């Protein structure tokens, strides 16, 4: 009953229905493995269809403490409190959890996105104001018998968040696991990067400067400057049969082709090799251009199919965002401190190429690829 419990619009996040308060107030909540605060609009905003009304909830408790949260994109401030929370299309339980009532925000809420709040599913260590503010999923596990694990299948868009388990109907082939290096973000280690089978030939610590995270709340694949520049150079070379403006590669400008004629074949596959659970072993996940060229829906341009380049530069480490997670089933195995990847039942791919998760691979170089 949890399958297909996510919705979204491309590039605007995936959200699950939740209720807060007594009696329950229904809100759509963005699922974010890249943060650890549960926060909801709690005052009028031009882009909010509805918001949390604390005065109507008998079970609301004010914590008399403000909080401020800056993201890569956007920021908000609010008042901390606790209240009862449920997930209608998740486990059938009710938990009391911390909630940040957003009273002011800047470039956070998105016009027409259909969500009114955000569920930070990462660890207390990056919670604001500090790590003593217990994250929602921690409260969920403490207060119920739900297993300490959840999985995400991100595919108008939809998908599934399976809480407490793994649904075999959502993937094919094998699940490969990479260790969670540190429990704050869902931090992982990338050991090798190839573009159309060609190694970028970098010291592997560069791939994880200064960290690499799995982040459902970030749209793009974000790469450290040095890695980004090398990637773009190789993708340009592979697709050189056509030339695009530098603004396209900066992720700022659209590229369009006549409807139905996108030249997928001139764009390379990208392989990210992730540290395995055994010494010097790895597996790779392979991303097709259908993933890193993000379609931008606009009726005005609909004579064409237009895309944004959904790989962009980072100064804060690698971010494996939605572009990467789409077409994979991703298991956040908190209990065993590992992340699993498998090919998703909802894959794009064409008649020539298919996204993959495969291994094992062995590395002779004994260097630790972690930055710290
Ligand atoms: C021209 C290129 C544009 C690229 C846009 S893009 O793809 O980066 C990009 C595109 C869309 C969103 C974001 C983005 O910052 N995502 C937020 C959540 C969010 C979701 C929806 C709207 C606004 C925000 C994550 O939480 C980001 N996760 C960590 C990286 C993070 O910043 N964690 C915080 C650490 C400090 C405490 C709070 C959590 C980035």
From Swiss-Prot:
Expressed at high levels in the brain and pancreas. In the brain, expression is highest in the substantia nigra, locus coruleus and medulla oblongata. Residues 14-342 form the Peptidase A1 domain. DXXLL motif is required for a proper endocytosis and retrograde transport to the trans-Golgi network, as well as for regulation of lysosomal degradation. The transmembrane domain is necessary for its activity. It determines its late Golgi localization and access to its substrate, APP. The active site is at 32, 215. N-Glycosylated. Addition of a bisecting N-acetylglucosamine by MGAT3 blocks lysosomal targeting, further degradation and is required for maintaining stability under stress conditions. Belongs to the peptidase A1 family. The chain holds residues 62 to 446 of 501 of the full protein. It is found in: Cell membrane; Golgi apparatus, trans-Golgi network; Endoplasmic reticulum; Endosome. GO terms for molecular function: amyloid-beta binding; aspartic-type endopeptidase activity; beta-aspartyl-peptidase activity; endopeptidase activity; enzyme binding; peptidase activity; protein serine/threonine kinase binding. One of its GO terms (biological process) is protein processing. It comes from the Eukaryota. It catalyses: Broad endopeptidase specificity. Cleaves Glu-Val-Asn-Leu-|-Asp-Ala-Glu-Phe in the Swedish variant of Alzheimer's amyloid precursor protein. Its main location: membrane. It comes from Homo sapiens (Human). Induction: Up-regulated by the Ca(2+)-regulated transcription factor NFATC4. The lineage of its organism: Eukaryota, Metazoa, Chordata, Craniata, Vertebrata. Responsible for the proteolytic processing of the amyloid precursor protein (APP). Cleaves at the N-terminus of the A-beta peptide sequence, between residues 671 and 672 of APP, leads to the generation and extracellular release of beta-cleaved soluble APP, and a corresponding cell-associated C-terminal fragment which is later released by gamma-secretase. Cleaves CHL1. This is Beta-secretase 1. Its EC number is 3.4.23.46.
